[PDB]
Amino acid sequence: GMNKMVINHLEKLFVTNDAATILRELEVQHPAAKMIVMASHMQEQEVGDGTNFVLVFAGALLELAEELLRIGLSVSEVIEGYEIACRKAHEILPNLVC
Amino acid sequence: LVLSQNTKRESGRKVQSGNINAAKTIADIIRTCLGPKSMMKMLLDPMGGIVMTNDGNAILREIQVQHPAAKSMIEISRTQDEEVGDGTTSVIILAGEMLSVAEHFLEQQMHPTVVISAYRKALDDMISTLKKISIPVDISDSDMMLNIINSSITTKAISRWSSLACNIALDAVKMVQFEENGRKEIDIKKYARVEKIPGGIIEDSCVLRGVMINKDVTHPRMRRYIKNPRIVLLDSSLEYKKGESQTDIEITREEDFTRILQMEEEYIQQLCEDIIQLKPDVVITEKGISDLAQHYLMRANITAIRRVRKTDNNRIARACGARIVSRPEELREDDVGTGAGLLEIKKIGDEYFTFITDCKDPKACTILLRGASKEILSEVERNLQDAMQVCRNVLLDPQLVPGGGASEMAVAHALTEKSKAMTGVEQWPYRAVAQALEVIPRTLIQNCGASTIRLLTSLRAKHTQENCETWGVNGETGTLVDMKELGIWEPLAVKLQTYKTAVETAVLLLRIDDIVSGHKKKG
Amino acid sequence: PLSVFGDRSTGETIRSQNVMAAASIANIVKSSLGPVGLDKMLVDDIGDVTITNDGATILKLLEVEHPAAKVLCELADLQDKEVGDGTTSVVIIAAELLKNADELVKQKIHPTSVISGYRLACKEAVRYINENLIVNTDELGRDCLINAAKTSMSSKIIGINGDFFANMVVDAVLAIKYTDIRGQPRYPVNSVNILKAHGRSQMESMLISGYALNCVVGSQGMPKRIVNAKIACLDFSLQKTKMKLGVQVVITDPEKLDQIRQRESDITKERIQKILATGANVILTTGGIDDMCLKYFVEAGAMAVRRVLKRDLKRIAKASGATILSTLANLEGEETFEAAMLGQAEEVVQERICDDELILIKNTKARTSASIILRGANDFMCDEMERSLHDALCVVKRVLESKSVVPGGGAVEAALSIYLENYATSMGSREQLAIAEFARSLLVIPNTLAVNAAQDSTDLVAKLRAFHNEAQVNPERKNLKWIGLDLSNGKPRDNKQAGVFEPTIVKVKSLKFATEAAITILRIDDLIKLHP
Amino acid sequence: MMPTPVILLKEGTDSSQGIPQLVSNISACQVIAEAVRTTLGPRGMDKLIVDGRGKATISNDGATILKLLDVVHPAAKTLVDIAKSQDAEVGDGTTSVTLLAAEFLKQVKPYVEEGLHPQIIIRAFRTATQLAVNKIKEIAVTVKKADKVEQRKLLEKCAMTALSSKLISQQKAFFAKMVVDAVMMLDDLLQLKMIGIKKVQGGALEDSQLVAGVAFKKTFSYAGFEMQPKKYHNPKIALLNVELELKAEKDNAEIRVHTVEDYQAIVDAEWNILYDKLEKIHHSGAKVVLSKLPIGDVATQYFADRDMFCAGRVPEEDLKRTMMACGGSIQTSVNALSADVLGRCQVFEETQIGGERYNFFTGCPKAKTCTFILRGGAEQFMEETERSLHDAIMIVRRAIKNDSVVAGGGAIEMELSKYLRDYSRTIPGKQQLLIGAYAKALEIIPRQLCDNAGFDATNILNKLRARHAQGGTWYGVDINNEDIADNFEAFVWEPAMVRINALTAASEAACLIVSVDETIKNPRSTVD
Amino acid sequence: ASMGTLAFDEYGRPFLIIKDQDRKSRLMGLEALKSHIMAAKAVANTMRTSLGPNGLDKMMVDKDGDVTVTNDGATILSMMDVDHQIAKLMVELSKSQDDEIGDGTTGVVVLAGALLEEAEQLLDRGIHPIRIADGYEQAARVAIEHLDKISDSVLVDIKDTEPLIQTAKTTLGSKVVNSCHRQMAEIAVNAVLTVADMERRDVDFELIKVEGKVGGRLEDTKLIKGVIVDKD
Ligand SMILES: Nc1ncnc2c1ncn2[C@@H]1O[C@H](COP(=O)(O)OP(=O)(O)O)[C@@H](O)[C@H]1O
Ligand SMILES: Nc1ncnc2c1ncn2[C@@H]1O[C@H](COP(=O)(O)OP(=O)(O)O)[C@@H](O)[C@H]1O
Ligand SMILES: Nc1ncnc2c1ncn2[C@@H]1O[C@H](COP(=O)(O)OP(=O)(O)O)[C@@H](O)[C@H]1O
Ligand SMILES: [Mg+2]
Ligand SMILES: [Mg+2]
Ligand SMILES: [Mg+2]
Ligand SMILES: [Mg+2]
Ligand SMILES: [Mg+2]
């Protein structure tokens, strides 16, 4: 990954590839993106790493949900399937410990 | 400063994403206006009128957009409307769907040229499959012609009166058909005029066996009802006018002024006598007629009409078998129009209309539309234009194709099966653009209100069987029905044009990655 | 102290500014080079849209204010006018030459030495191309023309359909072929009428074995099809005769006015019967035709077309054997029209093309003409197809006139780079660096192609240079001169067998023009810009 | 792009991404380097920068020039930051770091334009920098003798080399000797605050002197000061932090009396407190009294009556220097003014220097501090002299830390470039181009020297390359003779870690600049 | 030659490096040297008319309208409202000469202007300015050595003040007090000699109070071996 120079509202220069810092220094105004940013910051607070993973996974999930909505599935069905798959993934994950 | 201050340039993935999004938005504008259960839209004309329609081209024509991709899509709509006259919403929807599935690949590391090559190969296979699944049509059978026109207009507001509109369109197209010097033509544009008079009832609308114009006799004395008139058509004026050369006169004697005026009158009389020598009953001319000419014609009991538009005069010439002449001195018996079986000037509302509506074997016609108001009649005229365009398209090419999404699914399945023997990198875009054809049954189901996913899955499973190419979706009940028993069919030319135009729109918008703007025309 | 009412730039500042302007112009069009290049969409701030890939068109449409950038803009225009192809390569090469020359100047090398080195390198590159890198088209046949056309139409909207478009282009060019004095077959392109009409797919484009007019008959009473056409081309209007400015009509006896007014139109009438009495069927005129003469033609059953463009009329007359007649005057002071002034064609039809009608003069006798009707999806697509078609026609004309071609895909550039890098060591002491920089600047074309292909340019160009070095070192490996770039697979490829050709004149003229432009810009070390 | 009624980022946010922004960053770094390009070498030139308030600054120091420039380009500010870092860690080479970094970036710009992935460039820079630093440490010349005369000669040569680019280069031997003498009297920490630098307007450079003690300006003497003798031949100095004047006993003190006898007793008590402090100071045996706090007129007259010298409001740094020179102790209470806490110097004298009065404490034999008194025709003249002397002092300090020297004039960089080119000739080839570009970029300093001197850089570079390739380690640019020469024999000496830090900082800056691919600029808040 | 750099990048994107770079000017090399030399020449040519016994005075007006008629070069340049930086350098040089010596504040400016004037035509012939500075330094060393060689010593004894009076007269010749020349020189010499540390030490100027009162005549100026105060 490549570093990014970010100039905040106070002209303080940040150069980093840390997703949480980049999101923090960005003036995000769309509130759905705000929710995803809060999720990333919560991941940073709880663990300290994986914020970019959180953001990428959320984006991929929402794009595939948009595809599912376009093909005919309802929002509730997509949400239920996502929850079921998340439970299955959390069940599978302990077996992948090397 | 290298470029101008107002020159804006952007390039990269952003330009491709923006173009595809603009095309998708253009498609989304008219998504609900497809199918027999489509709903109409009200368009507010900037000059102050109101356009109430569900025609794709009519809707898109009134939209003013700034994004050049949207302009490209509008031009695509206009081209599809001009070439075949039907399938205007379908081409826009297909172009949007193909551009979406192309954006999918562009998000990855696939160069647009690969997607374009796959699109062109897929388009060739699409054309081949459509030509394969086509069926012939016997044009001599009027029932098949009427059914085809009905399937064409069943998605418009005129569908409530289907038999009447179908008969009107079929009769107009058949009688405007012409052949001369070994050349065949239809020419719905110049002839077969549609003239609408607001008021009355729509069931009173009919196609006249001739031409009707909004004109009255130049003076009350001439007859307003002639049984078997011999019509003479003129182009020049019947009045004394100046010449082109500088022709000043010099009068020095007493009687020269009176002689000049008497020569003007004598010239008018000579022209009128030249006209009368053919013994006609009706004189139609492009330009004005002097009052003295009217008197001279009345002395021979001739009805005269002046200031007729050139297109109307050509229509009358085709209808009654006359020839427009300019110099009455050269008026021959061949130019006299015999063949009209009745001429009548009757009053409709508070206006006078001239009818020549009993011609034997006429090559021109007028379609008289009566309706609730002007906008309703405008929509009816658009529907009739679509019907006539479909009629002429199927009359030129007698090939026919199943409708209601059956052809879309059949071609998609055939392309998907062909895609199993590629083993290259182009197989993915090929299959994606193949499956993009499912948007037509999908939007038909969505407009019908049924479940899209279940119905589409059932249709896709059905099309995998050995003989199910004619299986589509019943757009008004949301059920899978064979189209050889429902009766919905489309001309092969319309489907071919729609597919080609959508694929090439996708190619054209994919070929672009840089946008520069703001420069003056420099001319 | 100068007291000049203007801004003055001198030293390295103006040189850097000129190089920046040239680099900006180059970078504008660098993304439209090679088959993996992509088109551009220009908006004319009134909503007018122009989608194109031609570099010359892009630079001509753009607004340019810097003089150095202008120099490159009309450089591309001149390359278009004199060759017709390679209008982007010339700009890129000129900008790279300017950049490397500016680097040398900043290294305290005097610009005169750089200019001398550039001149020597250009001369030697032209000589090396002429005596080492050309392929004679005599032993290749029509396949050479097909491959050259296909290579020209790559990177264009009609690239994939080249298998058919190249056949059409070659057929049209061979059809319009003529031989002049001295036995030199000339191919007068721009005599191929290109007509654009949206509608059916690209594959429905038609090549007319004759000529196509963008005009219709003047009257609906005339027939729309004549089998044995006897074309009469006229250059005067058939209207009511009007006396000129120096002549007036003054009437003292009223009995003469009717005769005057009658003859006023009987003159044109008599001209019409003189034209028609010889057996003419199709009458074409540059001027207008009024209603009475249109009726005259209607009665005779002939076709009359008005407001015909002068160039189209000249082409029709040349193809059909008719003679343009600005007047009906013989050497005896009389009004006459002989049958020898009539052109002949096997058929003249007014066909319908997507809610519009145009006249097709099919199979003219005594000369073979050609025309192309381009079918697209909208106006922008048709315009881009027309531009690409013109490029292909120019390329085919250059190949047929000058019967030498060179391998494409950067093979020539790599070979010249290697040869000039070797050659620089033999000439001078400071112009050697200039020749080396010329050789390096010649390498931008394969680099740009590889970069546009979204591939590793460094290793691909290194492999290409290694191949050409082996070709130039080992006498028995001279077959590697044709090693070019395969942009689809990202590998070196023998382009001579792959069918990637281009006229030698393209490379020669591009090199000469780019060198001259770089030399011209390189001589500026001071700029005075007076206020308006 | 579409309007997107609800936008993601705040309106006005500017984003630049891809190769074009990296090329723009490289160009900005080139622009920054060009601003300090001509201040390198003995033929360097000064730059005059005027701030918003109209005050001008004339300087040859690269870090100073870069700081006075209001650079706002995010990528260009890295060059200023590394120049400041080089100034902080080393003190010399602030011009070379920017040139090296910008030249690295310019050399790798063509490969960046070819789409080369930046990580390869970064790895190549790291490897080349590690090899260059190891080579510098290997070939640096050090002498293991612990000889005082040789060490002093090395210090003087290093100071002369560090000084031979400023306006005091004509007297570089003189100031180099002063700097070496001043640094050798610092005890163990080599603190800069223990070397006073006084700028007195008027006078030639040769009039500037180094005081073996402490000197400071006269500080607002009160009435009666002129009766105090201004020369002592063996004074004892009382360094105090005491306010010797009549004043309220405490800020919150309050006196309540109800008898006129108590009123008189109170006024007499205040006078007796002041006189008791003064009497203790007098009986301490001291002859010179210096206080950080103000000394009143009554105390001044009291001291004058005793033939004693007083100077109140002495700055704290000057008192610290006086304590370190004379060897006393700063006292906040005068209750125990024993002989242990009293300073001592051979001679104290007040003399006039260019229209100002200065107090001189000379003759201290065990002094651990210094005082530079600089003369010049303008205040910017003295400022630039102070900057140059600061550079020399920093260089001498680092040389005291370790006596590892390399020959200057670009000789070290030619050796490094030859070594790196030889190394790059033996690797597969993708890193070979990058390491060769690094080696070529290492040639900028001698080329810049030749360009500044008005030479022909190409011929000198060719001769240097040929000499280094065929044998010869310390051959650099000979400015006077317009040729090349063995710079080690010419005593163009630099501490090795100067070049070590220069290379490290330049490589780090280049890697950081190359690593960035996208720049996002949020709109300003409260533009006012 | 101004506005710094105006490039705006070769990709069309904004290219901002220095804050307010569009409103800042910049001069490069030889043109800057010529401008500085011309400004210094202007200052020196202004100063040179007030040099010597026949030199004329400059009549300075400050921002408040106060008028100062003077011949002292340092006083003229200090009150001069200059904006060019090289003019400020000239002012500071004259002030430095005043501080160190107290006399000759006009000779320094003229000499510097002449040196830069010659350096202009030397630079025009293609000599590096550092070479010119080195040559000037060498020649200045030669001149200083020659001055030491040709110097002459005088007695600074109180018993014989004739050389001191002559030196003071030479200093005062160019000023307006040349009407009272010998008397004024005598009072200056006696003022210095009365208050001075005899062992070649400093002369404390704040023990000499210079007080002026309007009225009377300039010849009434006198040296009082005491203190005069504005009190009664
Ligand atoms: N009764 C029907 N049931 C199902 N589908 C129908 C029916 N009638 C028409 N269609 C389908 O609707 C499409 C026509 O939609 P329409 O509203 O006419 O759009 P357009 O005007 O662009 O052709 C045709 O492809 C046809 O297959
Ligand atoms: N099929 C191909 N494979 C490899 N290279 C090609 C191919 N076709 C063209 N090229 C090369 O791409 C380069 C760019 O051509 P292009 O930019 O399209 O023409 P122009 O310079 O007239 O715009 C040409 O120099 C040509 O050698
Ligand atoms: N006598 C000399 N001969 C040749 N080069 C010298 C001499 N003295 C110093 N240099 C060169 O000058 C450079 C230092 O210039 P300067 O601007 O003083 O400091 P910086 O290192 O910040 O540039 C060194 O690289 C050194 O090689
Ligand atoms: Mg992490
Ligand atoms: Mg329809
Ligand atoms: Mg080309
Ligand atoms: Mg230094
Ligand atoms: Mg004097």
How would you summarize this macromolecular structure in one to three sentences?
The structure is cut from a larger assembly and holds chains A (98 residues), B (523 residues), C (532 residues), D (528 residues) and E (232 residues). With 532 residues, chain C is α+β, with helices and mostly antiparallel strands.
How would you characterize the overall build of this protein?
- The structure is cut from a larger assembly and holds chains A (98 residues), B (523 residues), C (532 residues), D (528 residues) and E (232 residues).
- By secondary structure, chain A is mainly α.
- Helices cover 63% and strands 9% of the residues of chain A.
- Chain A has helices at residues 19-25, 31-46, 51-71, 75-92; strands at residues 3-7, 13-16.
- In chain A, strands 1-2 form a two-stranded antiparallel sheet.
- The longest helix of chain A is centred in the middle third of the chain and has 21 residues, at 51-71.
- The radius of gyration of chain A is 17 Å and the shape is globular.
- The two termini of chain A are 26 Å apart.
- In chain A, 15% of the residues are buried.
- Chain B has a four-stranded antiparallel β-sheet.
- Chain B has 523 residues and is an alpha+beta fold.
- The longest helix of chain B is centred in the last third of the chain and has 23 residues, at 374-396.
- In chain B, strand 16 and strand 17 (351-356) form a beta hairpin.
- In chain D, a hairpin with a 5-residue loop joins strand 2 and strand 3.
- Chain D is elongated.
- In chain D, helix 2 (62-68) crosses helix 3 (77-89), helix 6 crosses helix 7 (172-184) and helix 14 (444-453) crosses helix 15 (457-469).
- Chain D is α+β, with helices and mostly antiparallel strands and 528 residues long.
- Chain D is built from 16 helices and 20 strands.
- Chain E is built from seven helices and two strands; from the N terminus they run H-E-E-H-H-H-H-H-H.
- Chain E has a two-stranded antiparallel ribbon with strand order 1-2.
- In chain E, a hairpin with a 5-residue loop joins strand 1 (58-61) and strand 2 (67-70).
- Chain E is elongated and about 85 Å long.
- The site of one magnesium ion has 4 residues of chain E, from loops.
- Chain A: ATP binds at residues 50-52.
- Chain A: Mg(2+) binds at residue 49.
